[PDB]
C-alpha cells in the first residue's frame, strides 16, 4: 500500500496543484510560486474548498492517509524553483489548508482521532523554548560504514536498526555528520481547552502540541489556535519489549502548522438602541441584587464597554480599557458580588483576589532545568486578554504582581526577564478592581493615601475609584435585607430582569462594532468643563484627593 | 566534497602579490593566524570563495592544513614559536544580522555583526579551547526595539578576548546547525538555532 | 465443541435470550429507543430479571465475557432486524447500574475474577488522559510487506505481539486506521463508612475504557459496576521468573425505617429535642451545653472536651475529617500538591478538605496555622470551593462542606462558630463537674438517621411566616449599641436553616428562627467584650 498511496496522490494532487481559479492553471500557481522563492519562505496553502470539488477523497484520505502520503508528496513538491539542482539546498517547507468544515474539542480530539487532520482551535498555554531536532540523517559506524540518511525524526533519540554490517545499530554509533542533518524547528506547548467555552464542571486540557517553525512566536500562553526492513524478525522474539515504544504511546500524536434571529435580536437591540432609560434598563439586569451604589454599578456597567484610539501620534495605540476600583469593607459589603456579577459575562477572568499562592503571573518555563514549578502564564492577568480581570484583595498583591500590573496596565504586556531568558507579552484587557482598605472605613477623615493602603503609582493609574461604605441606615436598612431575604426567598421567586443576561452580552457584542468619534464642537464642553473641573479643583475647594 | 583543492590551495598559498605582501606583513610578529578577504580569494581564484557555504569547515581545515605548511616553510622560525596556525579570515559580504536569520543560511561561513549581551572573557579543554559570548544587535526604534532572539556565539581560541562587552562589532564565523543540545550536548541560537563558529571581529 | 477455558457451549443459552429480548415486555419500549433514536449501551440493574430465566441468569457473572459479546451480538441480531434503516452503527455494550451485591472487593476472592461486580467506594483519583495502543501491523522482509499483526483479526492484544516497527503503528496507525486505543485508570477507595478501624479498605486499580471515560470524577461517590481483571506479576519484564500474584485491574462497565420514622415522628413531635438531644448530645460533659447545641445545627485549654466533641462529631458521622495545624498544614486538608515518585509526575495532592465536600471539618490548633496556609481558609470559606491552578490539573475543588475547630484574624467573620471555654472559677461547679465524673466513675443511630432523612428529604422555606422576622431581627441584632447587616443574616438564615431541617417541616416561623437569635446572640455575647 505504502508506495501506491505515496504515488497515486501526486497525480491527483499535481493536476489539482496548478492553481486553478481566476481563469486557470499556470498563472495562479506562478503567483504562489514567485511569492515563494523570492523571500525564501517555502510555504503555501491548499484550500479544502476546491479539492472536494476536485476530489474530496483526497480531502478525506489525507485524514486517512496523512502519515505516509507526506514524505513523497513532500519530496515531489520541491521543484517550484523550476530547477532540480536548487531543491536539495532547501531546508524545509510548511503549508496549510483552507476551510475544513470542522474542528473538534480536545476531548473530541480523541484516541480514535489521534494524529489526524487538525482544525486548530484553543488556548496557547505554558510555552517553551524552541529547538530544531533532527528529522533525517546519519551517525553511521565510522569503523564500518558511512551515511544512511534516516535517524531521530520522530520525537525519539537515535534511529537505524535494520541489516548490519554496521547499518543496524547492533553496533556502536554516535558522531553525526552535523553538516548533514534535518534539524528542523519547534517548541512544545501545553494548549489548554478554553474554559470560556466550557460547561462549568470541566477541568481543562493542556495539550502538549508543538509550534514548529512556521507556527513560531506567533502566539502567547493564553491565546488563539490559528494553525525494506530486516529479517522477517517478527513479534514475540525473545528480547523485545514495548517499554521502548510506549512513551510516545503515552503522548499526543498530532500536530499543527501555520437570519431573522440576528435581525430580531438586532431589532430588540435596535429597540434597545431606541430605548431610553437604557442604563436602568441595563443596570439591574446586570446588577440585580445591590442597593445603592447606583453610580458604582453605573461605571462598572460602562467599564464593560470599550472603545480604542489607534496610534496616530506614532506613540502607542492609546487606552480604551478601564481600571476602576471599589473601596470599602470586607467582602460581605458585596464587592464580591460585582466580581461575581461580572462572571455573568465571558471574556472574564476571576481570581481569589490575591491571597492565593497561585504563582502564575510570575512566568517561567515549566521544564527549566529538570522540570520547573513556575509556568509560562500570567493568566492571573493575561488570560483575560480583550476581556477583563477581576481582582479582590488587590492589597495582597505584595510583590509579584506588585510592579507587574504597573507597566502592564501601562503597556499591556509582561516583560518577562530571567537573565538567561527574557520576553515580553501582550495583555490588552481591563482591570476590575476592589480591595479592602487598612482595616475598615476610616476615609471619612483620613486621607485616601494610606487609607487605600496601597501605592501611589497605581491608585493614581486607576481610571476611577469607587466606594462601598457600610452604614446602619434604619431609614433604609429595614428595607435592605428585606430585599436579601426576598433574595433568599428562593422557593417561590425568580429575579425580575429588564431582559436576558445574554442579549446584553450580545448587545455589548452589538455595541462595540459600532465606533464613535467627537465633532469639531464637543471638545469645548470637555474643555470648558474639564477647565471648570480643574477650576474648582484648582481654586482651593474642599478636596477629597489631589488628583486633577 | 572532492579532494584536489587541498594540494592546490597549499600551492595557491605560494591576487597573490597581496599574499606575497601579506606573508611578509605577518611576519616576525608570530601571531598564529592568517587573514584573507572574500575579494582576495576570488582575486586569485573564484573557486575558493565558492567553498564558503559548502565546505568552509573543511576549507578552514584546508586553510589550517596549508597555513601550517607554507608558513613554517617560509619561516621555520615559527618552529620554536607555537608551531601552529589558527586562521583569522576577513570580510565575507552579505551579512545576516540578528533577524535576517535562516536555517537556510547555516553550516556556512558568513560575516555578520552583533553586540555583547554577555561575555565570558576571563573564563573558558573543549570549553577551554574557546569561550562564550552572548549577543544581540539592534538600536532603538519601536519595531527594532522589540526583543530579538539573542545571538550566543563561541570564540575559538584566537578571536578570543578581542570582543569586549558593549562592542557593536562585526562577527564573521561559520554558522553551523550543530545544536547538539537537541539531546543534551550543546547550545546555539534561539528558534532558528545555529551553532556559530567564529572567524572575525570588529573593534571597540 | 466447547470453550473448556471457560466452559461455555456453542452459544450455550443464546436462543433463550433472543426470545428474552422479545419476551421481557412486561424492553419493548426500549428495544426501538436504541435503534430509532440511536442511544446504544444498555444500562441494566443488579439484574432482577432472575424472575424470568435462571439459565440465562446464573451465567450473567459466570464466564459472561463470552456472553456479553453474544449479547451485544444477540441484541444486535434482533435489533438490526428491528430497525436496519436507522442509525444501526451504534453498537451496544451493556452498562449495569447498582449491580449485584458486591462482597466489598476488600473481601472478594483470589478466585473472584470472571465476575461482574460493583464498588462501594470513593474516588481517590482519575487517569487523566492516558489511553493506550490499539492494533498492529509490522513490516517483514520480502521487499518488506507491512504485515498486519493485531490489525490481523483473530490475534490478541498481547504484550510483545507489538514488539517491533513502531511507526507501522505510530504513523501507519494514522495511515492504516488503528488509531490507538483507549483505557482509563482510576484510583478509588472502597470505604464502608464504619469500617472496623484500624484495618483499611481497598483502593482500586481501575483501568477499563469506555467513553464513559471521565464520567467518574475524583472524590466521587459510587454507583459503579465493573468486572475484574488481573495479570501475573513478572519478577521482571526482562525475565519470565514469576511473582505469583496477578495484578488486579478492573473492567469498568458502569452506566423498619417507617417504624423508626414513626419513632422519629415522636421525636419530631417531641418539642424540646433541641434541648433533649442537647441533653443527649456530647453527654460526656456537664455545662457548655450551649456549645453542644450548634453541632446538631452544624450537623444539620487543650482538648478540654474539645477534640472529644470533634471526635464526638467524628464518631457520630461518616462525612467529616478530623485534623489540625502545627504538624499537618493545609496539606492535611488540601494543596498537598505532589507526585507519584514511582512515576515522577505531580498529583492533585490534598487532604481532609477534599474529604470534606458536603462534610464537616474538624480542625484544631487553628491558632497555629500559617499564612502560607490559612490563606487557603481565607479563600475557601468565601468560596466553598478551592481553585487549584496546577501543573497536571488546573482546576477548582468544590469543598461545599462545613467546618469547625477551635484554638486556645479579622476574619472570624467567616466562621460557623466557636465559643469561649473560660473558667467559671466555681469549686461547686467543679464539684458538679467532679460529680459528673465521679458519677462517671442507640440515640446515636437514631440521631444518625434523624440527621439523615432531613439530609435526605427536607428543605426549609423561611417565607412570610418569618422571612419578615429576619428583617425584624438583624434590625434588633444590629441596633443594640448602634454588625448584622453583614452576612449575619446569611448566618442567621443558616442557623434558622436548621430547626426546619429539624422537625421535618419545610417551612419556618419566628420560633425555629428565634432560637438562632439566642445562639448568635449568646455566641456574640460570649465572644463580646
Swiss-Prot record, chain A:
Binding site for ATP: 291, 331-335, 436
Class of this enzyme: hydrolase
Catalytic activity from the UniProt record: ATP + H2O = ADP + phosphate + H(+)
Single GO cellular component term: nucleoplasm
Superkingdom as given in the UniProt entry: Eukaryota
GO biological processes: DNA replication; DNA replication initiation; double-strand break repair via break-induced replication; mitotic DNA replication; regulation of DNA-templated DNA replication initiation
Keywords: Acetylation, ATP-binding, Cell cycle, Chromosome, DNA replication, DNA-binding, Glycoprotein, Helicase, Hydrolase, Nucleotide-binding, Nucleus, Phosphoprotein
Transmembrane segments: none
Record-listed E.C. numbers: 3.6.4.12
Sequence motif Arginine finger, residues: 460-463
Modified residues (Phosphoserine): 202
Sequence positions bearing Phosphothreonine: 234
Family label: Belongs to the MCM family.
Protein name as annotated: DNA replication licensing factor MCM6
Curated annotation (Swiss-Prot), chain B:
Disease note: Deafness, autosomal dominant, 70: A form of non-syndromic sensorineural hearing loss. Sensorineural deafness results from damage to the neural receptors of the inner ear, the nerve pathways to the brain, or the area of the brain that receives sound information. DFNA70 is characterized by slowly progressive, postlingual hearing impairment.
Binding partners and assembly: Component of the MCM2-7 complex. The complex forms a toroidal hexameric ring with the proposed subunit order MCM2-MCM6-MCM4-MCM7-MCM3-MCM5. Component of the CMG helicase complex, a hexameric ring of related MCM2-7 subunits stabilized by CDC45 and the tetrameric GINS complex. Interacts with DBF4. Interacts with KAT7. May interact with MCM10. Component of the replisome complex composed of at least DONSON, MCM2, MCM7, PCNA and TICRR. Forms a co-chaperone complex with DNAJC9 and histone H3.3-H4 heterodimers.
UniProt protein name: DNA replication licensing factor MCM2
Full-protein interval shown: 191 to 447 of 904
UniProt modification remark: Phosphorylation by the CDC7-DBF4 complex during G1/S phase is required for the initiation of DNA replication.
Known function: Acts as a component of the MCM2-7 complex (MCM complex) which is the replicative helicase essential for 'once per cell cycle' DNA replication initiation and elongation in eukaryotic cells. Core component of CDC45-MCM-GINS (CMG) helicase, the molecular machine that unwinds template DNA during replication, and around which the replisome is built.
Gene: MCM2
Location of Phosphoserine modifications: 138
Residues bearing the modification N6-acetyllysine: 20
Assigned protein family: Belongs to the MCM family.
Lineage: Eukaryota, Metazoa, Chordata, Craniata, Vertebrata
Domain of life: Eukaryota
Subcellular location: Nucleus; Chromosome
Swiss-Prot record, chain C:
GO CC terms: chromosome, telomeric region; CMG complex; MCM complex; membrane; nucleoplasm; nucleus
Disulfide bonds: none
Residues at which ATP 2 binds: 286, 306-307, 408
GO annotation terms (biological process): DNA replication; DNA strand elongation involved in DNA replication; double-strand break repair via break-induced replication; mitotic DNA replication initiation; regulation of DNA-templated DNA replication initiation
Domain MCM: 273-438
Post-translational modification: Sumoylated; SUMO2 modified in response to stress caused by inhibition of proteasome activity (in vitro).
Record-listed N6-acetyllysine modification sites: 54, 265
Membrane spanning stretches: none
Effect of residue 198 to R: Reduced MCM complex DNA helicase activity. No effect on MCM complex formation. No effect on MCM complex ssDNA binding and ATPase activity
Subunit composition and interactions: Component of the MCM2-7 complex. The complex forms a toroidal hexameric ring with the proposed subunit order MCM2-MCM6-MCM4-MCM7-MCM3-MCM5. Component of the CMG helicase complex, a hexameric ring of related MCM2-7 subunits stabilized by CDC45 and the tetrameric GINS complex. Interacts with MCMBP.
Extra remark beyond the main annotation: Early fractionation of eukaryotic MCM proteins yielded a variety of dimeric, trimeric and tetrameric complexes with unclear biological significance. Specifically a MCM467 subcomplex is shown to have in vitro helicase activity which is inhibited by the MCM2 subunit. The MCM2-7 hexamer is the proposed physiological active complex.
General function of this protein: Acts as a component of the MCM2-7 complex (MCM complex) which is the replicative helicase essential for 'once per cell cycle' DNA replication initiation and elongation in eukaryotic cells. Core component of CDC45-MCM-GINS (CMG) helicase, the molecular machine that unwinds template DNA during replication, and around which the replisome is built.
Entry similarity comment: Belongs to the MCM family.
Listed name of the protein: DNA replication licensing factor MCM4
UniProt gene name: MCM4
Residues of the full protein shown: 150 to 774 of 863
